[PDB]
Structures are given as C-alpha cells and as structure tokens.
C-alpha cells in the first residue's frame, strides 16, 4: 500500500549517532518510535531509543554490525529495517582550524585536524582562482596534508576541505560538510 518514510543514519565524528527521517510526506504527522541493536557483540539486548533519534557514544560500536529499525504505533505488523556497515557511513565534523602555511615561494601546504579520527580518513580539497569558472579537485591519502604545486602572487584562492571515512577502516562514500572557507589574501 504505502512505504514508510525511510531513514538515513550517520555517525558524526564518533560522538553521537543521529537518524533523521521526514514525517512530513505521510498524512497526520507523527514522530514514530526507533529501535536498535548490535548483533556483533555477544550478550546483547534490543533497546528502545526514547531520546527523540539520538544515541550517545556509550552505545556506539564501530568496525562491526549494526541494525536499525522504525516502528509505527498504529500498525505494529508493518515496520522498516536495514543492515548498516557503521564504518561505511561515518560523516565526521567538518575539519576545524584549517591551517595554511607557505613552505616555498611558489607552492603551498594545507593542514587540518579532525575532531576525533585521524588514521581512518581520506580527504578532498577544492581550490579556485580569480575569474575561474570551475573548481579544481585533488584527493589526499590517509595523511592529512595536501600540497598545491603551482601558485600565483596576485591571484587569490579559496580552499574548502571535506574528509571521508575511507579506505583503511571502511569504505564510506559520502563526504563531510564543507568546512569554513579559509581564504588566501
């Protein structure tokens, strides 16, 4: 007949877990119940969220299996459920304190410290230039340093960086939110 409004869940920098589902599409808007359980660990239980959802770091286990489900009170028979690789859906905070420093007269290096995770993240940088129609991309390895080989004096560049939980400890595809745009003068 009708499908449930579904849900995407993203772990934010391994601080708390947030699942957001839009109840606007269905008639008679309702904030349905949410559940969760960790299959991987032995001696496990089915828990109720009751924090409308949100889960604290006390109940987040990575590198392992996690299952989410949504239940509506009117029709208990009908529900939803998904199987999630929690290391495939980590969306950390946008990196803070995007430090720029200038090693040589014609090349640049970029540094940024993520909030919690260091050794399991890949990065992307987009830089532009004066009058540029487009934006030039470049990927970075698990190390958090990117180098721009060619720069110009009078021209000015805009850098925005988003990290990604890939590939050493997962295969997350979605990118982080754009950080505060650090501007070169």
């Amino acid at each position: 007949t009708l499908p449930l409004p579904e849900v995407q869940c993203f772990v934010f920098n391994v601080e708390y877990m947030n699942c957001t589902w839009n109840s606007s599409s269905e008639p008679q808007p309702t904030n349905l119940t949410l559940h969760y359980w960790y299959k991987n660990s032995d001696n496990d239980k089915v828990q109720k969220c009751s924090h409308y959802c949100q889960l604290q770091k006390k109940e987040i286990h990575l590198y392992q299996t996690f299952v989410v489900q949504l239940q509506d009170p009117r029709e208990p028979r009908r529900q939803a459920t998904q199987m999630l690789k929690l290391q495939n859906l980590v969306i950390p905070w946008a990196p803070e304190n995007l430090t720029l420093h200038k090693l040589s007269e014609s090349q640049l290096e970029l540094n940024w410290n993520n909030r919690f995770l260091n050794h399991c993240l890949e990065h992307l940088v987009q830089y532009r230039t004066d009058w540029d129609h487009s934006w030039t991309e470049q990927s970075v390895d698990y190390r958090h340093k990117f180098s721009l080989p060619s720069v110009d004096g009078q021209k000015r560049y805009t850098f925005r960086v988003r990290s990604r939980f890939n590939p050493l400890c997962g295969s997350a595809q979605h990118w982080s939110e754009w950080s505060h745009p650090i501007h070169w003068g």
Epitope: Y157, T158, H180, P181, H183
Partner: antibody, heavy 120, light 107 residues
Framework: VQLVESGGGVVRPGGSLRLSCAAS????????MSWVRQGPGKGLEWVSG????????GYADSVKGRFTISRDNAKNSLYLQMSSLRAEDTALYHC???????????????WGQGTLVTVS | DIQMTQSPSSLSASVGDRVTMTCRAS??????LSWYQQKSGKVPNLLIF???SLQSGVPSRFSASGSGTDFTLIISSLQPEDFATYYC?????????FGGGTKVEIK
C-alpha cells in the same frame, strides 16, 4: 540558470517587508549571491552580499543599519527583509548571481531580473 | 568607499565609428572591473570578462583595454544593436559600486 524572487506591496515609512529569491539550475554552494537596485531616475546601485556560507555579509553606505543578507543553502534560497524604510527607497530590486566580498574567486556576475517595491 | 564615474555620458557617433570610452575609479583596483550593456527595457548582460578577456557567446567585435584605473572600451563596425549604457563595475573591495552612465546617439 534563472533567478526568481517573491514580494510586492507598499508601506508607509517605518514598515517592513521580506524579499526572498531562489536560484534554479545552479550549484548553490559553489558561488555566492548579491543585490543590485535601480531607481528610475538614476543608474544601478549595489546593496549587499555574502559568501555562500553566511559568514561574510556585506554592507552599504546607506542601508547599513537596516538589514543585511541572510542565506539558507539547505533550503537553497536567499533573504533580505527591509524594515524602518525611507521615502527614497522606491526602486526595482534584482538579486544577482556572482559578486564577491571576501578575497579569492571573484566570479563576476549573471543578472536575474527583479520586481518593483515602493514606499511613501 | 569606492566611487565610479562613467564619463562622458553623451556621445556623438554614427554607424561604423572609432571612439573609445572610459571609466574611472575613486580608489585603485588592479584588474577587478568588468563591463555591461544596457539596452533600454531589458536586463543588463556581461560584455567584458574580469580584466580584458571576453565571455563566450558574444561576437569578438567588442574590445577593451587599459586595465587598472582608467579602463577603456572600444567597438568597431557598429551595428544597429549596440547603442546602450555600459555601467563599469568593480568587485575588488566591499561594498561594490557601479558607474554613472554613458548614452550614445543614433543618426
């Protein structure tokens, strides 16, 4: 590639009115917005602008203390709500793709039409 | 702030003439100044790119030079669709400002 705004009406001095414009066919986060006005007697004039992140709002000489631009990338729209107006604010308002306030990536501009607002 | 005076406002020329026109700026700008074209009753459009280059979709007939303080524009082999206002504009230091206005006559 189009820019469409909403609004209309008249108000005596000291009133308020919201002007919201949205972009279609664009990557909103990639480039920033601006505002340009024209009174029938004179030429174009710039109002204000930001840097696609709501962090470097720009001012003008005369409209500095009234209101300054707001943006919502998630909703993909831009807002300018005037209040405490004056008789010399009767003009036609356009919100324009492009512009720049902070340094770097000054992308020029692409105009997007507008409508008229008047106050006594 | 930054003030732009687009002068002269009144010009005298006919089809196929060689007269460049200038723009002036109150404060110095290196190469941050574009140009526009305003035929009566329609939205302006971009005509000169950042400093001296040209946007695509435009005939190569229009030309510009003198980047810096006194930008200048020049057009050759005038057509019946080129008489308008130019409105030199800068995007160097906020707030942005436009020029005065130049009007060209038909004979």
């Amino acid at each position: 590639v189009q820019l469409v705004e909403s609004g209309g009406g008249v108000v005596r001095p000291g009133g308020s009115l919201r002007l919201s414009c949205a972009a279609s066919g664009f990557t909103f986060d990639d480039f920033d917005m601006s505002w340009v006005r024209q009174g029938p007697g004179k030429g174009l004039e710039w109002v204000s602008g930001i840097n696609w992140h709501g962090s470097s709002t720009g001012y003008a000489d005369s409209v500095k203390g009234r209101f300054t631009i707001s943006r919502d990338n998630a909703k993909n729209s831009l807002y300018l709500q005037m209040s405490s107006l004056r008789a010399e604010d009767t003009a036609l308002y356009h919100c324009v793709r492009g512009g720049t306030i902070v340094g770097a990536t000054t992308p020029l501009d692409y105009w997007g039409q507008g409508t008229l607002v008047t106050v006594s | 702030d930054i003030q732009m005076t687009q002068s002269p406002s009144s010009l005298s020329a006919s089809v196929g003439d060689r007269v460049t026109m200038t723009c002036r700026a109150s404060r110095t700008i290196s190469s941050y100044l574009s140009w526009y074209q305003q035929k009566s009753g329609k939205v302006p459009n971009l005509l000169i790119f950042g400093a001296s280059s040209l946007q695509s979709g435009v005939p190569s007939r229009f030309s510009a030079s003198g980047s810096g303080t006194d930008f200048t524009l020049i057009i050759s082999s005038l057509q019946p669709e080129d008489f308008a206002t130019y409105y030199c504009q800068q995007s160097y230091s906020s707030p942005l400002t436009f020029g005065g206005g130049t009007k060209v006559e038909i004979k």
